[PDB]
Amino acid sequence: NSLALSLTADQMVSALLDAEPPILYSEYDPTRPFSEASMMGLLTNLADRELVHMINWAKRVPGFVDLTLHDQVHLLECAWLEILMIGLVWRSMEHPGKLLFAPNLLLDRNQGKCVEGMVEIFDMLLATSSRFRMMNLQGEEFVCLKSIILLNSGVYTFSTLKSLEEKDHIHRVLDKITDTLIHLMAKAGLTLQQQHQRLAQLLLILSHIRHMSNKGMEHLYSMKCKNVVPLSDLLLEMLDAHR
Amino acid sequence: NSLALSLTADQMVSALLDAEPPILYSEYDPTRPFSEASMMGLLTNLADRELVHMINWAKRVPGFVDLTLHDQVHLLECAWLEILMIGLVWRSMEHPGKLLFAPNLLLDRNQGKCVEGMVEIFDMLLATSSRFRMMNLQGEEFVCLKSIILLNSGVYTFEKDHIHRVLDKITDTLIHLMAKAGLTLQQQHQRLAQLLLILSHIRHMSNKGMEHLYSMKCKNVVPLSDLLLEMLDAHR
Amino acid sequence: KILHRLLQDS
Amino acid sequence: HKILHRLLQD
């Protein structure tokens, strides 16, 4: 018996909106330009503090608590950077050409060259943010996509007859979020053709978010070996799950 | 403008089905006990020949010729391994627990250990094949998903308005296929979502496969073709 | 795992 | 010069 399967479309959006994590500040001090090691320090420190809120956000995502602890660990390990990236891209919608990592940390692609190799990932994140702007992505749609990422990115990486009912339970919650997304677009006055098209457009962006997370995960492991910036113990464990 | 947007949904399905590349065979020596170098040679030799057919398949995808040469190049460079993988996964549906790289090259996860670090991607591919098999994926849906990968994977690393228009056209085509198969409205967009979410994992497998293929380059286990090296090099 | 500990934390 | 350029034009 799961209360997630019993939620209505509006109750689904309400639960997700109420579970939104806070927008954290960085330690950025504009008095002195930062180095590659210190700019990455701000980024990795910010991500580490966000992971704590993401974990407590994931529990409030309907259906996530019904999963086993090892499955919750697996989903977060596989999805954590995707969830950070879509949040960054969402915050940056109203700031063309810039990435709003924190309210006190708004970076253009020129300043992103301070970190070696971080330039290509910077343009990809900007293009995703520009795509959300061109589509006029709604906050109700955004919280749906972020929950899909949590549940979907690790579902195809899981044996017994008892593993199917939990695997099927995730696809049931995923189906519920799909119904919720269509419900939102039908309210906005879109035809059935426009609803299906917008639904497809949103999900195809998740393919690019996975791509950005893959490249970002490899770049995060690069500086880990280079011993450049101190990485937190949780961030290292998140990084070791992919390697 | 583009003649692809003027096609109907059935004309899109028929044009995609006719553009299908053939199923190629592997080199036919059945010394079934494989070595690391021998199987890597077989797979890369297969990929090289499949790449040639993929390029001519891409030309026959409605709306792909309308793009400029530079954009056609960028899309194939970004998507080629995804396209190879979804084809492999589609071929392996009727062979649970095995991967049908070619009709005479059907490997299982135990044979994936012959190469250093390949068994991980093998389990992911097998899982994707199992997921298509459980969804009862139809060939008409498969060709729609494969074209979607071609036009979508590189679109946000850039004209672009036309690609999105063709993408919507394929979405209309997918819904059209599910409506014919008797699915209700709720079942239609639920299945549409389930199919498109699998493309996120296919991208994941491709990125992992691109890493593994790059290890072969700087280990020099077997010479790679110039075409395969240029497709691999485009991912830096 | 820190993640497992934080997920079960209460 | 890319091989991909040539195969796309033939």
Comma- or semicolon-separated keywords:
heterotetramer, A: 243 residues, Retinoid X Receptor, two-stranded antiparallel sheet, 8 helices, 66% helix, C: 10 residues, 1 helix, 70% helix, transcription, Nuclear receptor, transcription factor
Biggest sheet descriptor of chain C: none
Portion in helices of chain A: 55-70%
Order of SSEs of chain A: HHHEEHHHHH
CATH level-1 class of chain A: Mainly Alpha
Q: Care to count the β-strands of chain C?
A: 0
Oligomeric status of the shown chains? Answer: heterotetramer
Q: How many separate structural domains of chain A?
A: 1
Number of helices of chain A: 8
**Number of beta-strand segments of chain A:** 2
Number of helices of chain C: 1
The dominant shape of chain C is: elongated
Region (Transactivation AF-2) (chain A): 8-243
Organism (chain A): Homo sapiens (Human)
Region (Interaction with AKAP13) (chain A): 1-243
Family (chain A): Belongs to the nuclear hormone receptor family. NR3 subfamily.
Provide a short characterization of the protein structure:
The complex is a heterotetramer, with two copies of chain A and two copies of chain C (10 residues). Helices cover 66% and strands 4% of the residues of chain A.
Could you characterize what this model shows?
Chain D: This is Nuclear receptor coactivator 2. Chain D: It comes from Homo sapiens (Human). Chain D: Belongs to the SRC/p160 nuclear receptor coactivator family. Chain D: It is found in: Nucleus. Chain D: A motif (LXXLL motif 2) lies at residues 4-8. Chain B: 17beta-estradiol binds at residues 50, 91, 212. The complex is a heterotetramer, with 2 copies of chain A and 2 copies of chain C (10 residues). By secondary structure, chain A is mainly α. Chain A has one domain (1-243): Retinoid X Receptor (Orthogonal Bundle), CATH 1.10.565.10. Chain A is built from 8 helices and 2 strands. Chain A has helices at 9-18, 36-59, 69-91, 118-134, 139-152, 161-187, 192-226, 233-242, and strands at 98-102, 105-108. A two-stranded antiparallel sheet of chain A has the order 1-2. In chain A, α6 (161-187) crosses α7. The radius of gyration of chain A is 18 Å and the shape is globular. Helix content of chain C is 70%, strand content 0%. Chain C contains 1 helix and no strands. By secondary structure, chain C is mainly alpha-helical. The N and C termini of chain C lie far apart (16 Å). Chain C has one helix at residues 2-8. Classes of the chains: A mainly alpha (243), C mainly alpha (10).
